[PDB]
């Protein structure tokens, strides 16, 4: 009954849900990630400024297309794009 | 209408919220994000395999408590310890 938990903890079933899709149930994959950013989220993106933030996960993202991300990874990775956007708590 | 939507976005939420508490509305203190987990989050801790990434973040938590956090540094911080536990798919 509280913010970080349903919220954060809602990110765990992320994993357990994308990942639980084919027979992996612990590995995601360098595309699903990308696509689990662009796709999921993806609404209060404009300008991005953390250009550095979304191209450095971006980067290594289209760097490698063709192996599989971890649970860490891919959490660290949501959080960094999530805040790359200096305005996240103006939405005019 | 999205998992890592109405998860991962609700945490730019609490941001906004508890920050939003004092004047302060982008800066977090030290103590409001250790409790910030260890309140809202505490709840799937049993032993935390990865005793590294929450004694990483709650040592540098515990090291200056008297400093304020950022937005990025508050979020980077919830993923590494909703993260460190191994177990965070089997909870029966």
Redesign the interface.
């Known amino acids: 009954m509280?913010?970080?938990?349903?919220?954060?903890?809602?990110?765990?079933?992320?994993?357990?849900?994308?990942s639980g899709r084919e027979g992996d149930?612990?590995k995601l994959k360098k595309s699903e990630l990308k696509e689990?950013?662009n796709?999921?989220?993806?609404?209060?993106l404009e300008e991005i400024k953390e250009q550095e933030?979304v191209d450095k996960v971006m980067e290594t993202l289209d760097e490698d297309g063709d192996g599989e991300c971890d649970?860490?990874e891919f959490?660290?990775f949501?959080?960094?794009v999530?805040?790359a956007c200096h305005e996240?708590?103006e939405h005019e």
Do not use: G, R
């Not at 509280?2 to 994308?18: P, W």
């Not at 796709?39 to 209060?44: G, I, K, M, P």
């Open positions: 509280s913010e970080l938990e349903k919220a954060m903890v809602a990110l765990i079933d992320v994993f357990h849900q994308y149930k612990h689990l950013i796709n999921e989220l993806s609404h209060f933030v649970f860490q959490m660290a949501v959080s960094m999530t805040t996240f708590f």
